[PDB]
């Protein structure tokens, strides 16, 4: 794909609502698609000003499978989708009743990926790890990719690590849709490592770094 | 509650997204809070114009427990919440993988209830009853109300009736929050009947009528 | 149904396993099918002797919809099933990860119903309400009955009440199968009240009383 | 662990019930614990004689993490558990409503592992892949192992491959308990490949081969 180069730029815009708290997020990043790495800086603006009202980790994974190292042989569903574009839909089912739904569109112009998302979370316990910001980040995960009904699906039981050392379970279910038909890959897995680094006390300013590599199973 | 009268008016505004389709909804209605009845007319405007892209039944229940006939003895959690106001958070877990999250705020001025909501649905099968608009409406349901952690929770396994006669299961989980502390009711059930009537072919123009009555259990 | 009389007797046998603890249960009861009431006494024998290792409430609902007051007009799926017999399959999905599956067969000879069941529970938290026997009984519930694929299904979000006053959620999903085809009823609800009374300290000896009435919806 | 040798033998006994169909299973196998491999032959005897009434794949994973290649550095929760023994509890939540619960105990005498299990499945659609025996086997999976409340938990979204090429989703949740306290490992993943080979037309006679390797994450 002559459209996806070795070095890419990214820009993000998110409109969201968690437990009634409205917010918007802006971000900018840089990435190496073939190497499976990317880093970005985000700014969360709560509708009512003030610090981030919940754990940024519920948003991190929403902020691009094109940033995955795929073996040169295997069909790269994500890379093939450009320049037409892709849409993503993800369900997050947390173990304590909290549920978040997120949907986003990724477009590309030149070396720049524009990511526009909508995020909505409800029913998180007022004192749980999400609302109390007790999480540290996602443990490495192996997302199972399967082809289902012409599109690629991703399923994985992920874990958000907690301050004291515990873990908080989240089931992820995602639909990866392409604007145009692409050559489908075989069922596989994507190993991902995502690290979050708060830049300010409130957590409104934050950095994310991710490394992802696909494995033939 | 001298604040809630025998005849009330309602106005609605919804911002939503289902399977990537953005839309907004406006509505107006009239209701009898003590009698447990209400009727309203809505107008859906898809971001990209055109007919309603999915079943309006996924939105109907989002569009006010104040419209419930409660025995005069029993604490009315909803009526007591005004004029301060209330917030609602509902998770809809559909049997075929579709998930919708919705959150809304209800305020009151004089005899008018203003309802502002956000709705987000993802992962609905492209050919399921929701996206193909194959539903007719919700069967009558008995929502179980329980008090949990200072707020009222609602849980119920509901069924969306289908054109050919079948049914499509949906698990509802809702948090009913009041702006100010109110006298809590005992665990109870709310029997509800909601009827949808399309006013136009596309379904963008639609009427809803609902009857709800609380029962001591 | 000349086969189901006004006064019936019941006998029960259950083989079960909960969290690795094997046990058997024997019971005997009396009931009034048309009145929707029944009472029975059970004896639990843990494989390793000793007191009941978990809350009997997880078993109570396993121990006969024939004991439901149905309007004379409405098809009685359960009563019509005899004398041929019926089989039941129920999934119990508890809110804290515990899951129980149960299957049973009911046969009839004269005025006596023989109930043979198998119960299996796993993953209950070692310190949860089930293993610590912190429950008091089920709150009244409204089981939604729907016809699906030639058989009757029952769905309901039930609540087990806890000693201190709290509640523990359980989603029930049941398949009610008849040995022979019967006239199907319309979707309806069954209101049930079940009361448990421990006869001994260990809870191995226990009494159950239930009242159920069907309602056209 | 001088107790677990390079070559081990295995014997199995299972008592089960799926959709009302009672059965028992006997088996014998050989394995290489340090190499992470094992092979066994099983014989299913349906209570009512006749061919296997459902897909053997729902049972395969029930039939020993000791057969996993663990890096010599990392604590091997399973190997350390012997000779005292271990107990397992697994919940299988299938995508089409079928649910199976299974619990088993593994003991060791000399070079022989004795595996005694109980399996119970209910609510599988009469025409689904399980009851119609339309599955071919499990796709390779990465089970996430986490330490929770003194015991090891396993969570994974697995997929049963279907005859025509499709896949059928199953969420697995397992508790791995040891008779005696052992040194806990860090959160990790176990990559497993299990292959089923029917030895007879009915599928009552079947062979299983599995390869598992643990990975530090």
Curated annotation (Swiss-Prot), chains A, B, C, D:
GO biological process: bioluminescence; generation of precursor metabolites and energy
Coiled coil regions, renumbered to chain: none
Protein modification: Contains a chromophore consisting of modified amino acid residues. The chromophore is formed by autocatalytic backbone condensation between Xaa-N and Gly-(N+2), and oxidation of Tyr-(N+1) to didehydrotyrosine. Maturation of the chromophore requires nothing other than molecular oxygen. The precise stereochemistry of the tyrosine has not been determined.
Top-rank taxon, per record: Eukaryota
Any single Pfam family the record assigns to this protein: GFP
Tissues of expression: Tentacle tip.
Uses in industry and biotechnology: Fluorescent proteins have become a useful and ubiquitous tool for making chimeric proteins, where they function as a fluorescent protein tag. Typically they tolerate N- and C-terminal fusion to a broad variety of proteins. They have been expressed in most known cell types and are used as a noninvasive fluorescent marker in living cells and organisms. They enable a wide range of applications where they have functioned as a cell lineage tracer, reporter of gene expression, or as a measure of protein-protein interactions.
InterPro entries associated with the record: GFP, GFP-related, Green_fluorescent_prot
Keywords: Chromophore, Luminescence, Photoprotein
Keyword Plastid applies: no
Membership in a protein family: Belongs to the GFP family.
Function comment: Pigment protein that is green in color.
Protein name listed in UniProt: GFP-like fluorescent chromoprotein amFP486
Lineage start: Eukaryota, Metazoa, Cnidaria, Anthozoa, Hexacorallia
């Amino acid at each position: 794909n002559k459209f996806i180069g070795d070095d890419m730029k990214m820009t993000y815009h998110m409109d969201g609502c968690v437990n009634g708290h409205y917010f918007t997020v802006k971000g900018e990043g840089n990435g190496k698609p073939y190497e499976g790495t990317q880093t970005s800086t985000f700014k969360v603006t709560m509708a009512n000003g003030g610090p981030l009202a919940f754990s940024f980790d519920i948003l991190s994974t929403v902020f691009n499978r094109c940033f995955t190292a795929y073996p040169t042989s295997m069909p790269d569903y994500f890379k093939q989708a450009f320049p037409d574009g892709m849409s993503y839909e993800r369900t997050f089912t947390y173990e304590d009743g909290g549920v978040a739904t997120a949907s986003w569109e990724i477009s590309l112009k030149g070396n720049c990926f524009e990511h526009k998302s909508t995020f909505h979370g409800v029913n998180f316990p007022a004192d749980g790890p999400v609302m109390a910001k007790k999480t540290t980040g996602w443990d490495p995960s192996f997302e199972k990719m399967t082809v289902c009904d012409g599109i690629l699906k991703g399923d994985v039981t992920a874990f958000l690590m907690l301050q004291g050392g515990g873990n908080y379970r989240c089931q992820f279910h995602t639909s990866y849709k392409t604007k145009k038909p692409v050559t489908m890959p075989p069922n596989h897995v994507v190993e991902t490592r995502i690290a979050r680094t708060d830049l300010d006390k409130g957590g409104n300013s934050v950095q994310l770094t991710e490394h992802a590599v696909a494995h033939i199973t």
